[PDB]
Amino acid sequence: IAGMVVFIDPGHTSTNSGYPEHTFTWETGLRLRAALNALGVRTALSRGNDGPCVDERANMANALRPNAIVSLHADGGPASGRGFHVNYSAPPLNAIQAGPSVQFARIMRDQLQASGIPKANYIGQDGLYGRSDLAGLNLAQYPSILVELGNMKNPADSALMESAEGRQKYANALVRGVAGFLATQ
């Protein structure tokens, strides 16, 4: 999988303590980036600091023609909801969204779950959510999923997110998912 290309998009809500989504996603994205570089995988970021709106991120991603595009987010849901969901475009607007992107979503869900990140109990089904409303996924022409790693309003998710150890956990799970999909390609 060395020499493959992966585009990482740190999204942009907040935790009750006021730890912002954009910083969580930025930091976790950096850890994922380091892990991938360690695997010989070529990476890029949607932004260079802690930005672009959804179109330039689509054009950047498409322009780089990556093997995989992974967007990182955290939800602001009702407090009792916790866990991750992996969003993918459905119904597909092209053949990549119809196949490779779905496989990527399934492999990512499996690996996040195997790494100790609980699947969302309040949204999607079994940690997956096929949807038609997200511009970022719809416009993608290369394999692309959007991961909501958890709910910032949930005490447990927020506890993981506001902790460096938790963020590294999330990164380890993400890297297992990405590497897992890349190997099938």
Binding site for Zn(2+): which residues? 12, 21-22, 73
Name 69's bridge partners: 7, 144
User: 44 forms bridges with which residues in the sheet?
Assistant: 7
Q: Give min distance, CB of 176 to Zn ion, in A.
A: 22
Give the count of alpha carbons within 13 A of 140, CB side only: 33
Report the DSSP beta bridge partners of residue 7. Answer: 44, 69
Measured between alpha carbons, how far is 128 from 65 in angstroms, rounded to an integer? 24
Q: How far is the CB of 92 from Zn ion (least distance, A)?
A: 23
Residues forming contacts to Zn ion in the complex (CB under 5 A) are 11, 73
In whole angstroms, what is the distance from residue 71 CA to residue 9 CA? 4
Minimum distance, C-beta of residue 98 to Zn ion, in the bound complex (Å):
25
The residue whose Cβ lies closest to Zn ion is 73
For this structure, is 148 an active site residue?
A: yes
What is the smallest separation between the CB atom of 53 and Zn ion, expressed in angstroms?
13
Annotated binding site: 12, 21-22, 73
Provide the annotated active-site residues: 148
